């Protein structure tokens, strides 16, 4: 019933955001539908600025600040740090970003590209938070945290909003889940103007902390921290999130490893975005053996392609020819 | 005043395929604004059936010989035996494809996928040409040249018609060159309904027979089969295309192999699309260095993203990192 968010903060967020992100298209795939017996549309959140979602929450989240503050400070694998550094740049407010040694090398440069303070962590949920609130104290800064904070769901969750705009004849959405902001956000949006409309996560089996929790019915957070080529989505659900993925998330679909890889590179090939793995991680569980068991009434399945920031250098390891 | 195509083939054709084919976006980059002093749109034809525009000729073709034909033929680098198999395969009509032995892979494999009867030759114009007249002989089936033939050049043409609605206030087009189907029919179509607007054309240095025949006043071919990274513009202009160009074409922007695989990268990791490198030739000519003499006039540049056929594989020798 009460969550960290409601439907009028996402509105609020979206009214507040829009001027300044891109209204990013959905795309179809013949190839795609004929593989999953659906319909399916891809919403383009590779396209927005900084190469994800990430912006929608990193600008409501900075804009809701709004003397100035001395910093702004996060814990990210790479691309809240870019959108956050972004968000920040723009009101003259330096950024400093916590950031796992094994992140990409694309992301790190990315987040000093935008002129943040990288500080490298060790790859743990305990060890970005530990650090950031660290980095933290010693900058008086602010964190603004990648999933766990309301303005940053909020914006994530004004995704909802384009996407019933954009596909009015919608029903499902499947979202990638690393910490849950964007999938709380777009739980609470979807349930809130039509809850008929499914609303499905996507998480990896190397990362499967979400799935783990709905099946047992509490938080049950990643006990090592997760191997993935999905390198977005290692962060566990957290205290904000979970409550509402608990109550308002239909499903929650895990994908491995090689089903990861062959969605992205099929992605890739067939509709010719360039998706990073990690968005990779929806279109892999509609493609899933286990999603054959959805409803053949849930027909219109919209998959949210929620980000583009990969490394090519390294993507020449797990790449395979035909 | 007189050319193998007029203004009203092209707006026949686009009546007669745009049943059949993507209405493709336009995207934009603040990046590669900001780079080239410009503000650029990116015709996404990456994005149409088969990876590339040409789709809209083998449409437009195929349609327009509506007893059956016994089979079509043609010679192509990959992306017409493509579009042709597949324009082909809709009317049940077997299709015959010779493809230099050189050919990217991916080419290759996907004219198979289609269903054709793939025919390797060697890797020159007189080699296509030559083993596609045989085989039109063997089969007698009927031949639909990648770019000399009427209905092809008034189908790609229709890219402009599209281009000059989506974006009203254009000043030029980019278009990269091969055998000039694609910058015939664009310029027949574009300088008949504003020819304020220019349209230039850009080619490989490695093989710059449109740049050497519009210098010297004659149809110039390629001397020695081209070595370039842009598979898809080996072939040298013809006698149909030829005319049309020298007449009608603005400039001629030649960029270098180094050039294009900058541009794009440059596409892939700011744009999140994954053209292939024959489509990076139009962006190397917007960033080169005799771009910048183009009169500040022209400001709003709409560049053809032609394809977006790329051997991943193939790529990970020429693709640096940061
Ligand atoms: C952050 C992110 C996700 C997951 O979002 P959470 O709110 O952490 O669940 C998925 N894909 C990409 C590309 C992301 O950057
Ligand atoms: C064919 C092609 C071109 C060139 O078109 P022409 O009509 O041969 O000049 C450019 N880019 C791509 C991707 C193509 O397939
Ligand atoms: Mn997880
Ligand atoms: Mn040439």
Not at 155 to 177: C, F, H, K, R, S
Request: hydrophobic share 40%; aromatic share 6%; glycine share 6%.
């Amino acid at each position: 019933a009460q969550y960290d968010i409601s439907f009028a903060d996402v509105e609020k967020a979206h009214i507040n955001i829009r001027d300044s992100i891109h209204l990013t298209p959905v795309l179809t795939s013949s190839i795609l539908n004929q593989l999953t017996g659906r319909n399916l549309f891809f919403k383009c959140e590779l396209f927005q600025k900084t190469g994800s979602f990430k912006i929608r929450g990193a600008l409501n989240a900075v804009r809701s600040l709004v003397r100035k503050p001395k910093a702004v400070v996060t814990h990210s694998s790479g691309n809240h740090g870019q959108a956050l550094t972004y968000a920040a740049k723009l009101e003259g407010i330096p950024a400093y970003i916590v950031v796992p040694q094994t992140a990409p090398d694309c992301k790190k440069l990315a987040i000093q590209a935008y002129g943040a303070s990288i500080v490298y962590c060790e790859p743990s949920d305990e060890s970005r938070e530990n650090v950031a609130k660290r980095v933290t104290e010693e900058t008086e800064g602010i964190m603004v945290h990648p999933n766990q904070e309301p303005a940053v769901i909020a914006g994530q969750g004004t995704i909802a909003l384009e996407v019933l705009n954009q596909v009015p004849l919608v029903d499902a959405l499947v979202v990638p889940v690393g910490g849950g902001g964007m999938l709380a956000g777009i739980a609470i949006t979807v349930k809130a103007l039509k809850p008929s409309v499914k609303v499905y996560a996507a998480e990896p089996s190397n990362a499967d902390d979400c799935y783990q929790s709905k099946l047992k019915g509490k938080l049950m957070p990643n006990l090592y921290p997760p191997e993935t080529i999905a390198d977005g989505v290692k962060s566990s659900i957290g205290l904000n999130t979970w409550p509402i993925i608990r109550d308002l998330v239909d499903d929650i679909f895990t994908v491995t490893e090689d089903e990861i890889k062959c969605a992205t590179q099929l992605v890739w090939e067939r509709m010719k975005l360039l998706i990073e793995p990690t968005a990779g991680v929806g279109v892999a569980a509609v493609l899933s053996q286990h999603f054959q068991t959805v409803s053949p009434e849930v027909k219109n399945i919209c998959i949210v392609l929620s980000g583009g920031n990969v490394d090519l250098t390294s993507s020449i390891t797990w790449v395979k020819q035909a």
